[PDB]
Amino acid sequence: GAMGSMERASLIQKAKLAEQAERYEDMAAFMKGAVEKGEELSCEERNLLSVAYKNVVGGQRAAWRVLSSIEQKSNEEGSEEKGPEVREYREKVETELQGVCDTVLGLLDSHLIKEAGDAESRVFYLKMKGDYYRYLAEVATGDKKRIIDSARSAYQEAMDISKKEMPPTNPIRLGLALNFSVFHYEIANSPEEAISLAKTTFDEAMADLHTLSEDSYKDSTLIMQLLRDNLTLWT
């Protein structure tokens, strides 16, 4: 543990500083150090963990797509073979992405999920597990099937808990359904499942908005709009 000598509170404080400095690799290492202190994470601390790694892996995924697109063209009928360099560098970035995903998955498995009993924590981490198997799935070509089913499994367990324990407007529940929807559309090649899930999720939230405060209304409709954005593209 490179962060083993620093206090948990200081790791959290510096994570918050790193976020303000847009230093997300730092932010991620601080939150990893905080998790490995072994205490459960508060709601704010879980959100710090998620924001940090989403930004890190976001950069790698964007880089990977650029490189994969260049590679595909170089392999099109008519190209002038540039040599191994595009493939090698795509592989480099792909390998670093997979390691980030594996790190996150390691934190969830040792031992965030097993100690998460409240719906808000357990659903959060199970969604994260599905998310990071999904980013693995995006670059997978060889045992893609088991990675995909690992994503599916995590999202499905999260869905089941969210639907029993959370109201339909709960932002965690909405964000999970959003992501599981894109999983269906893009990863599982189940566009009709994706559309069905997104419509039902939106409509069930819509009918529960009346129970919310102004501020909770804002939080839920923000994610409801993401559901609608996708549905517009898909239909």
């Binding site: 998620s50 924001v51 989403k54 930004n55 976001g58 797509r65 697109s69 969604k127 998310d131 964000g175 999970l176 959003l178 992501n179 894109v182 559309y185 893009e186 994610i223 993401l226 559901l227 954005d229 996708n230 593209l233």
Partner: peptide, 10 residues
């Protein structure tokens, strides 16, 4: 690639 909406930042 066209990227669909998912939760949180980009």
């Amino acid at each position: 690639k066209l990227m669909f909406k998912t939760e949180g930042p980009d």
